[PDB]
């Protein structure tokens, strides 16, 4: 009943007798599978989990300079040198500035000048790689008919609630078997290698905000970088040496590139970190379901004899189906709930389609609640529940 209300809902009906059913499970979406003589089961992709990520390259976006020094020489006196030129922690660049008698040298010509400054990174971002073996998908299976509204918001105690089952698929084990109790088991043979090309996508970690970026664009980041887990390369990207009229050389820091990083990531998929595992909010997956080992719980029950009373008024869902919640005052349960659509009230020719396949009541006590989903035909129709004179009927209109 959890698929009722999602706009990305896809209805599939497999061939009669066949065991294999191909479905395409999207993130945040819900897939309802139906089959002849087989119950209605909801399959949903819940969350994408990637573990054991490896770093590739770290870029520096916020730095600070200190202990800036310079050294100058007269023309034809060789190049200028400072002690700091030997330290890989500093950034140095040499130029030629005009010199003469007005500057303190005896000859006119190009004089060599060197300027060094200490590079130290304050705030950095880190890029991590995704190993295909360390990839984990979470899929939820659920059948229509039981598990009323009281478990709609519930995330603790799922091992005790037997109506739902958790299945987790990785490229290390693309097969799974879920025991659904009364209905048997369901098989999942998914295609992990052909789900989405993650070899050309990298995991980007900013200041507690995370994106998914293309592999080539991250190698093109114009910031000081160093590979592996120190020694920074291309420090020049963050330090502007302003030469004023080819005479003086000063050093200035550029501001925080957080604005340039954020504007560039506009369009990439945002993600979140849950401890050591990374959670994604995007990605699709194709799967093949084995319908063989699935069975209908209670197909042999008898028909409910007493009357029903509407608990909630039939309302129309987004995709045109109608949800009805009814109360049964009878005591001869468990019994099969007689539901159908009718065009003529004398013939009662069953038209339309039943979403909750073979709806049944399992509780044996009176005043038991139960809820089902219906797909009425286009236009005017009648929802008839029960048998005999005590039956309840409601008029419906579609399109």
């Amino acid at each position, epitope marked *: 009943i959890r698929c009722i209300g999602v706009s990305n809902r896809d209805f599939v009906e497999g061939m009669s007798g066949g065991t294999w059913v191909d479905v395409v499970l999207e993130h945040g979406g819900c897939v309802t599978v139906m089959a002849q003589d087989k119950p209605t089961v909801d399959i949903e992709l819940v969350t994408t989990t990637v573990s054991n990520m490896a770093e590739v390259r770290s870029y520096c976006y916020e730095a600070s300079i200190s202990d800036m020094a310079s050294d100058s020489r007269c023309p034809t006196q060789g190049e200028a040198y400072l002690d700091k030129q030997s330290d890989t922690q500093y950034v140095c660049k040499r130029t030629l500035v005009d010199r003469g008698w007005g500057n303190g040298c005896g000859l006119f010509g190009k004089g060599s000048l060197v300027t060094c400054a200490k590079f130290a990174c304050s705030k950095k971002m880190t890029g991590k790689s995704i190993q295909p073996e360390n990839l984990e998908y979470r899929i939820m299976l659920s059948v229509h008919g039981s598990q009323h509204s009281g478990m709609i918001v519930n995330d603790t105690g799922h091992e005790t609630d037997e109506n739902r089952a958790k299945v987790e698929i990785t490229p290390n084990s693309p097969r799974a078997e879920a025991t659904l109790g009364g209905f048997g088991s369901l098989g999942l043979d998914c295609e992990p290698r052909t789900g989405l090309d993650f070899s050309d996508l990298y995991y980007l970690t900013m200041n507690n905000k995370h994106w998914l970026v293309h592999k080539e664009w991250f190698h093109d980041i114009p910031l000081p970088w160093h590979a592996g887990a120190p020694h920074w390369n291309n420090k020049e990207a963050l330090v502007e040496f302003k030469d004023a009229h080819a005479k003086r050389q000063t050093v200035v820091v550029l501001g925080s590139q957080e604005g340039a990083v954020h504007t560039a990531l506009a369009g990439a998929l945002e993600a979140e970190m849950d401890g050591a595992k990374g959670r994604l909010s995007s990605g699709h997956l194709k799967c093949r379901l084995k319908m063989d080992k699935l069975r209908l719980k209670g*197909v*042999s029950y008898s028909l409910c004899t007493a009357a029903f009373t509407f608990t909630k008024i039939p309302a129309e869902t987004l995709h045109g189906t109608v949800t009805v919640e009814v109360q049964y005052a009878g005591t001869d349960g468990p019994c099969k709930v007689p539901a159908q659509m009718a065009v003529d009230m004398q013939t009662l020719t069953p038209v339309g389609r039943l979403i909750t396949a073979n709806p049944v009541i*399992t509780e044996s006590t009176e005043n038991s609640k139960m809820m089902l989903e219906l797909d009425p035909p286009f236009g005017d129709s009648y929802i008839v529940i029960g048998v005999g004179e005590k039956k309840i009927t409601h008029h419906w209109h579609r399109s």
Partner: antibody
Amino acid sequence: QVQLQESGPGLVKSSETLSLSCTVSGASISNFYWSWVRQPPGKGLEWMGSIYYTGTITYNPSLKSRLTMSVDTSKNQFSLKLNSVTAADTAVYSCAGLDRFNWNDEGDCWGQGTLVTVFS
Amino acid sequence: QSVLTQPPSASGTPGQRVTISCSGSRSNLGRNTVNWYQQLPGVAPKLLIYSNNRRPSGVPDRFSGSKSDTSASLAISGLQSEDEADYFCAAWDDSLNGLYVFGTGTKVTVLG
């Protein structure tokens, strides 16, 4: 369509191990919880144990200390083994396919039953 | 297994309607169907009622079963001498791992 046939020793010695087999004919082995029942003369009906083709087992609590059950998927057979039988366990044993859930329009199916006597 | 309560014996004259009660609890009938079997001495039990009101093909129409919340009942119209036997109600229970529970059984005797 469906037929069940019991087969096993008609007479067994005391303190030895009792084994009985049940063959399924004309139906899929995966549609029933295959179970064993017995009737000691003078007492009432007692369900011994139930097993599914996957290997899920559940035994009568008063007999788990003494009872083992087996299932063969390829031969459409399943067998029963009872250790350390007494003179009290002389009864009419019968195999059948119970319905833990209905799943079947024709209801449950039952075999023919056999008389096993423990003599000592 | 658990125990399902039944009366010891039910009596009647040839041609009467005889009823047999079957009292259980919330664990067995509160969540499962109930079946009826006709037991003869020295043979396997014979199926009479499954899903609590259905007769397998071949059972005479004179056998019928009804149920309530924690109770069930079996009715036989037109009692004849060919029905002298024991009758057992049995049902699945949702205890530790699932038990098939048999009742205490009730003997039907054509009064002499």
